[PDB]
């Protein structure tokens, strides 16, 4: 109890220190051999790379500065890198290097070979409740840590959770993570995971992360999210209604948890009440969960991804391998000065 307060106070001191003086320019492009494209997005790519000196494998996120500026992502991009170099928690991906050149921004992260939770869930269909609870406990601890830093995460979904070689979760995306001691107003996220107050143009706070946790737990346990429809507007209408149905195989404890996380009235939502995160940690569905052992990663994971060594990429899709071009002309120098 007093141990937790002391740990989080130490953690916030370390975070703010790195936040105020970020690291910059800790490698360069020709230190790395490119191996395979792991993901492609509207502003960049993620590639498996091999550090030439050590042979260590990494995931290198490459962002085209001109596309980032075109798509109005300057603040999110700078913010993500600033978050990543400053946070420190077992279920958060580690930033190893970052640098920029004339054309691109580069974030070099530890390579998580097991791929996205998303693929595993869609492959297997749904997770049993013990399996789902194992992942859920990690998100709960991660949110407790981030919320202690006044960070709202806002981007939870199986697409954004990787499974490491121990079977534990690594959170990767922090563009939308905002420092919010009070309230904030941006409509952002993924429709299936949006809390009703984000849809409803009201100010909102970190309670939206506990709603999204409810969506995630439901999806992991059911194989599909609680609110879906052909078009996002119809998902929004279902979300703001207080109506949700559960598969008949959901346990009683699970439904009671979900009714308290998927609580439209944010003054009755678990995580947002007087006892904060402890209402979740002490809920009956988590009765078997050893919170400290989860944090220390001493719990036997329910699923271990198949990894035929370092640099195996079988848990990622195949993409068209395009050149990495670096222009003769410096692009967007002033906008990315702090990166």
């Amino acid at each position: 109890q007093e141990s937790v307060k002391e740990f989080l106070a130490k953690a916030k001191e370390e975070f703010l220190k790195k936040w105020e003086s970020p690291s910059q320019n800790t490698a360069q492009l020709d230190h790395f051999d490119r191996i395979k494209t792991l993901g492609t997005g509207s502003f960049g790519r993620v590639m498996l790379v091999k550090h030439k000196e050590t042979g260590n494998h990494y995931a290198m996120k490459i962002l085209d500065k001109q596309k980032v500026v075109k798509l109005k992502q300057i603040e999110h991009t700078l913010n993500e890198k600033r978050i990543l170099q400053a946070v420190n928690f077992p279920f958060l991906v580690k930033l190893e290097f970052s640098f920029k050149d004339n054309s691109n921004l580069y974030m070099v992260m530890e390579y998580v070979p097991g791929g996205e939770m998303f693929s595993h869930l869609r492959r297997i269909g749904r997770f049993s409740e013990p399996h789902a609870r194992f992942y859920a406990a990690q998100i709960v601890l991660t949110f407790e840590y981030l919320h202690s830093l006044d960070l709202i995460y806002r981007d939870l979904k199986p697409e954004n959770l990787l499974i490491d070689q121990q079977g534990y979760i690594q959170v990767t995306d922090f563009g939308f993570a905002k420092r919010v001691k009070g309230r904030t107003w941006t409509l952002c996220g993924t429709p299936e995971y949006l809390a009703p107050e984000i849809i409803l143009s009201k100010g909102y706070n970190k309670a939206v992360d506990w709603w999204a946790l409810g969506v995630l737990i439901y999806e992991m346990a059911a194989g599909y999210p609680p609110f879906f429809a052909d078009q996002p507007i119809q998902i929004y209408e279902k979300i703001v209604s207080g109506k949700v149905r559960f598969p008949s195989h959901f346990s009683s404890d699970l439904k009671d948890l979900l009714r308290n996380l998927l609580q439209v009235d944010l003054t009755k939502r678990f995580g947002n009440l007087k006892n904060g995160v402890n209402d979740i940690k002490n809920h009956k569905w988590f009765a078997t969960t050893d919170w400290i052992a989860i944090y220390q990663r001493k719990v036997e994971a329910p699923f271990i991804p198949k990894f035929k060594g370092p640099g195996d990429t079988s848990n990622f899709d195949d993409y068209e391998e395009e050149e990495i071009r670096v222009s003769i002309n410096e692009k967007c120098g002033k906008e990315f000065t702090e990166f």
Binding site: F118, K157, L187, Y224, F228, D230, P232
Partner: peptide, 18 residues
């Protein structure tokens, strides 16, 4: 079934941000 409705929704793949 609900799963059938999920499939019919077309939102079974990776979901982009808004």
């Amino acid at each position: 079934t609900t799963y059938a409705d999920f499939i019919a929704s077309g939102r079974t793949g990776r979901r982009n941000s808004i």
